[PDB]
Enzyme design. Structure first.
Site, short mmCIF file in Angstrom:
data_model
loop_
_atom_site.label_atom_id
_atom_site.label_comp_id
_atom_site.label_asym_id
_atom_site.label_seq_id
_atom_site.Cartn_x
_atom_site.Cartn_y
_atom_site.Cartn_z
N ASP A 45 0.84 -1.19 0.00
CA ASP A 45 0.00 0.00 0.00
C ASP A 45 0.88 1.25 0.00
O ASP A 45 2.11 1.18 -0.13
CB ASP A 45 -0.95 -0.03 1.19
N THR A 78 -5.91 7.75 -0.44
CA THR A 78 -4.69 8.31 0.10
C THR A 78 -3.56 8.39 -0.92
O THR A 78 -2.97 9.46 -1.11
CB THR A 78 -4.23 7.49 1.31
N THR A 79 -3.25 7.28 -1.59
CA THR A 79 -2.18 7.28 -2.58
C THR A 79 -2.57 8.08 -3.82
O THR A 79 -1.76 8.83 -4.36
CB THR A 79 -1.80 5.85 -2.95
N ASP A 371 -9.96 -1.77 5.28
CA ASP A 371 -10.21 -1.05 4.04
C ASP A 371 -11.37 -1.63 3.24
O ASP A 371 -11.68 -1.10 2.17
CB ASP A 371 -8.94 -1.03 3.18
N1 LIG Z 1 -10.38 -4.41 -11.73
C1 LIG Z 1 -10.06 -3.09 -11.67
N2 LIG Z 1 -10.26 -2.28 -12.73
C2 LIG Z 1 -9.96 -0.97 -12.69
N3 LIG Z 1 -9.44 -0.36 -11.61
C3 LIG Z 1 -9.19 -1.05 -10.47
C4 LIG Z 1 -9.50 -2.49 -10.44
N4 LIG Z 1 -9.16 -2.93 -9.21
C5 LIG Z 1 -8.68 -1.87 -8.52
N5 LIG Z 1 -8.70 -0.75 -9.27
C6 LIG Z 1 -8.25 0.60 -8.83
O1 LIG Z 1 -7.21 0.48 -7.86
C7 LIG Z 1 -7.39 1.44 -6.82
C8 LIG Z 1 -7.04 0.84 -5.46
O2 LIG Z 1 -5.69 0.38 -5.49
P1 LIG Z 1 -5.03 -0.34 -4.21
O3 LIG Z 1 -6.14 -0.94 -3.38
O4 LIG Z 1 -3.92 -1.23 -4.71
O5 LIG Z 1 -4.34 0.86 -3.37
P2 LIG Z 1 -5.18 2.07 -2.73
O6 LIG Z 1 -6.32 1.50 -1.93
O7 LIG Z 1 -5.46 3.08 -3.83
O8 LIG Z 1 -4.12 2.73 -1.72
P3 LIG Z 1 -4.52 4.01 -0.82
O9 LIG Z 1 -5.68 3.53 0.02
O10 LIG Z 1 -3.26 4.30 -0.03
O11 LIG Z 1 -4.88 5.07 -1.83
C9 LIG Z 1 -8.85 1.89 -6.87
O12 LIG Z 1 -8.92 3.32 -6.87
C10 LIG Z 1 -9.40 1.34 -8.17
O13 LIG Z 1 -9.84 2.41 -9.01
#
Ligand SMILES: Nc1ncnc2c1ncn2[C@@H]1O[C@H](COP(=O)(O)OP(=O)(O)OP(=O)(O)O)[C@@H](O)[C@H]1O
Ligand SMILES: Nc1ncnc2c1ncn2[C@@H]1O[C@H](COP(=O)(O)OP(=O)(O)OP(=O)(O)O)[C@@H](O)[C@H]1O
Lengths: 507, 507
Positions: A45, A78-79, A371
């Site tokens: 993350d 967040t990211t 989350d």
């Molecule tokens: N199958 C998918 N198709 C398109 N986008 C996706 C898919 N799965 C996840 N995502 C994108 O990935 C993002 C989430 O990424 P991840 O969970 O790896 O980190 P994160 O939750 O963004 O981290 P942080 O919470 O620190 O921002 C979501 O905003 C989503 O839009």
């Protein structure tokens, strides 16, 4: 002076802004963090990356402090907020070459943020509380970068059934207490949903039963043993036959003390400290569950679930300070032994247990459950579910370009820059692949130039372009609005600095 | 190797491309050129800058060679073509960072050039040959960077009256011979339009008349004097009284030779060499204009205007080898003495004389007349007059953006780059001012977003925005199409090089 200290502050922020750039997509690379003692950890993350980071530079601290205040809200945007802020800073750095000085750019960003917030509230739908098939896709898509090789179907049918208990009845206040225990086992990936009370404490004397029907839980604190505190009024001794008699009387008093609790209607004993081995037989001839060492975190969940009060002494127990339970058992599962109390009275909270192989897998789920529920409580209370997968930014970019044409002046370049900076999300979500490069961004840009076609986005599990609402990606709108607000607030705390001084006075 | 020798070729071209950047607007700075011997000259245009320039680098030679081939066409779109080529190179240099390699950009430029050429042919009007008030604005706006402090009204009413003579009758072939003489004087700025023949040669013996009515011009070459060539057949002498008699006979032969020309019908004598002083009195007792030293450039204009042939000998003159004139005079104007022959027969060409103060002012007009008639001959034969002043590029930029949306692929970025590079003309025409900066470009961009409003552009003599056809700026379309073609052809001769080798063999 005005242009020397300004570029350094942007260069110091662009280094820490592009660090979590690769950790955004679902199939992105991880980060290896080492320490001085020799602690090598792996973090996927971006929340942990901002914490354990060298904050020796003043510019690399305010952004982290702002992101920490936003992560405690919903914990999802967040990211992406840091990525958008870094993209905005990189786009505004090039605009400073025309010698315009930072002022109109801030006004343009403030004018574009309101328009974006107004447009986001018009591209959503209405999701009521009577649905069920819609509330599972958000939980399924919430676990992607954590571990989709074992969490994609089993972990998507137990979260909705556990959260939907007190949220559908009261759609306003649903503050619960969810606790995730970090314990290993031997299975591949097992998920248990306990509909009762879980106690993580073993014993040493296995001489007590563990199967009592319709037992009653009685909460007793300290002030039970013979010596546990102190006594100010000292006593004296006269005859040797008196101290032994007093000791025998105090020892036999426990018999009637337990008999009173038995007659009052209680079969479960939960003490804060430990129970002596001599006080076990007295609990075995009457059928009373014996337990010891109850943590406060596990004890506070007994007054709001079973319904019982606490006793500060021993003689303050009557009949109204008792509770009710169902079945208390002590099974040896996943190595350690835990106490399970099923069938309480008011099932408010719930307990989730994850069993893996080693020790870093279960922890990987520990950062995935928190989350996964946070995106549910903000769904029933709101209901403005939009099309996720990087489709809202592309939709707003096509509208900001035509909205910025109605104004005249130097503020149009700021709105155009803010609109062009929103296209960084599809470039980062497609950089993790090989057959994407840049053609995907060109294909998804001219597709929304007609009348409809809005739910289409991008999926890394196929390669082509299709709708996102039919697959299973339904990212909410609050996680996007809060991220945009944080990115717009963080980009203004650096351009309004210009010069920087120092002093030797504290604060 | 592929990326090392490629960036150097672009960096070597961007230096010579931005040299004539400031010499584009009407009120731009000049260029001071020095030599090794110590010749300090001042050049305001951009054609001379490309010639006298260090062409030691191979990249700084092909562009100049291409520009020289286009300057010999109409002589107007030379500096702007180099500016557009440099802007295209600078825009394409940044696009090479995405690792796409130069190939699709060339196809995009080739596809956008045809669209631009098709759109330019639809934004013009129809100008017939019966107009007169329209043909003077193009001549007035043709002299701006040369010297508008004396050429803005007087030099705008004598060019149209001089060109409109054989062009309105035959709208296809109008190749004339215009000669500009570089002579000083004493007046501020005087312009004379001679409707006849001008000879730039004085005399030494002012003993001949200079006012003959309805005189006839007779063209006689050499083979007139006693000794001018050689004789192979040598002669001998016998008696001393024979050589003197032969000399007297050859001297008296000139009397009857002149009498024959007088009886044939001629009063003007134009010889290639010089006329002896002894042959002047014989031309004074009969009323014959005596002249000598006629340049071939001034003699070739007598056979197509007056109508006479040449005689290689002296005995080949009869009656059909004579011409006709009006009034031959020899006045002392602007210091030197020149011969004026008025009223000929076929007024095909015309002579323009410019009188200034020093010596660098008249030369400043010498580079202004040739660039003022060239925009006229291409007006009657064509007639597709567009709105000048930097309005065609802004109009085509708003159309290319919406035209590039109908295609999908990596070729859209090339069309968008070519469209954005066309906005360099208004930025260079407004950089010479102080109250322009960048607001002018933003104001002239959103003005053409409605239905009409096309003739509006930019004028450096006011500050605000208004129409260009009502002021007096009517730049033709050929000078723009040829410039765009040259810029599109020159930008492809550098990106298709990549590597560069060397050899020791000639050619
Ligand atoms: N199958 C998918 N198709 C398109 N986008 C996706 C898919 N799965 C996840 N995502 C994108 O990935 C993002 C989430 O990424 P991840 O969970 O790896 O980190 P994160 O939750 O963004 O981290 P942080 O919470 O620190 O921002 C979501 O905003 C989503 O839009
Ligand atoms: N009053 C005006 N308003 C707007 N533009 C003008 C005006 N006067 C001149 N121009 C522009 O200036 C340009 C001509 O500039 P100039 O005569 O100084 O050099 P040039 O002829 O372009 O040089 P070269 O022939 O080498 O290209 C024309 O293209 C015209 O568009």
């Amino acid at each position: 002076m005005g242009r020397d200290a300004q570029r350094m502050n942007i260069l110091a922020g662009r280094i820490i802004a592009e660090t979590v750039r690769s950790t955004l997509g679902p199939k992105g690379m991880d980060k290896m963090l080492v320490d001085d003692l020799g602690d090598v950890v792996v973090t996927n993350d971006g929340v942990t990356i901002l914490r354990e980071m060298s904050v020796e530079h003043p510019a690399a601290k305010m952004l982290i402090e702002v992101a920490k205040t936003q992560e405690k809200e919903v914990g999802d945007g967040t990211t992406t907020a840091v990525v958008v802020a870094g993209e905005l800073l990189r786009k505004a750095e090039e605009l400073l070459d025309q010698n315009v000085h930072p002022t109109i750019v801030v006004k343009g960003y403030q004018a574009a943020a309101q328009k974006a917030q107004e447009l986001l509230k018009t591209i959503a739908c209405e999701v009521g509380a009577q649905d069920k098939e819609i509330l599972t896709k958000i939980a399924m898509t919430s676990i992607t970068g954590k571990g989709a090789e074992k969490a994609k179907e089993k972990l998507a049918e137990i979260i909705v059934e556990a959260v939907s208990a007190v949220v559908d009845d009261e759609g306003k206040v649903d503050k619960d207490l969810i606790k995730i225990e970090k314990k290993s086992g031997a299975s591949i990936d097992d998920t248990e949903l306990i509909k009762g009370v879980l106690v993580d404490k073993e014993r040493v004397s296995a001489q007590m039963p563990k199967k009592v029907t319709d037992a009653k839980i009685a909460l007793l604190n300290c002030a039970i043993e013979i010596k546990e505190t102190e006594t100010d009024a000292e006593i004296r001794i006269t005859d040797p036959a008196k101290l032994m008699e007093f000791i025998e009387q105090e020892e036999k008093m426990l018999k009637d003390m337990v008999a009173e609790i038995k007659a009052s209607g209680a079969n479960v004993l939960f003490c804060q400290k430990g129970i002596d081995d001599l006080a076990q037989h007295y609990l075995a001839k009457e059928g009373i569950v014996a337990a010891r060492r109850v943590k406060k975190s596990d004890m506070e969940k007994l007054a709001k679930a079973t319904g019982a009060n606490v006793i500060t002494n021993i003689k303050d127990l009557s009949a109204q300070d008792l509770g009710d339970a169902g079945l208390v058992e002590e099974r040896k599962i996943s190595g350690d032994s835990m106490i399970f109390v099923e069938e309480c009275k008011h099932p408010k909270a719930v307990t989730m247990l994850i069993r893996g192989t080693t020790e870093h897998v279960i922890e990987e789920v520990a950062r995935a459950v928190d989350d996964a529920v946070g995106v549910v409580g903000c769904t029933i209370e709101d209901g403005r579910i939009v099309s996720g997968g990087g489709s809202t930014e592309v939709e707003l970019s096509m509208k900001l370009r035509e909205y910025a044409e109605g104004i005249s002046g130097r503020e149009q370049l700021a709105v155009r820059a803010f609109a062009d900076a929103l296209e960084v999300i599809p470039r980062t979500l497609a950089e993790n692949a090989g057959l994407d490069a840049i053609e995907i961004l060109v294909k998804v840009r001219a597709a929304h130039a007609s009348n409809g076609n809005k739910c289409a986005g991008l999926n890394v599990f196929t390669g082509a372009v299709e709708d996102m609402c039919e697959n299973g990606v339904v990212e909410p709108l609050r996680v996007k609005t809060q991220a945009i607000q944080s990115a717009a607030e963080s980009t203004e705390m650096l351009l309004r600095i210009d010069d920087v001084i120092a002093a030797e006075k504290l604060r």
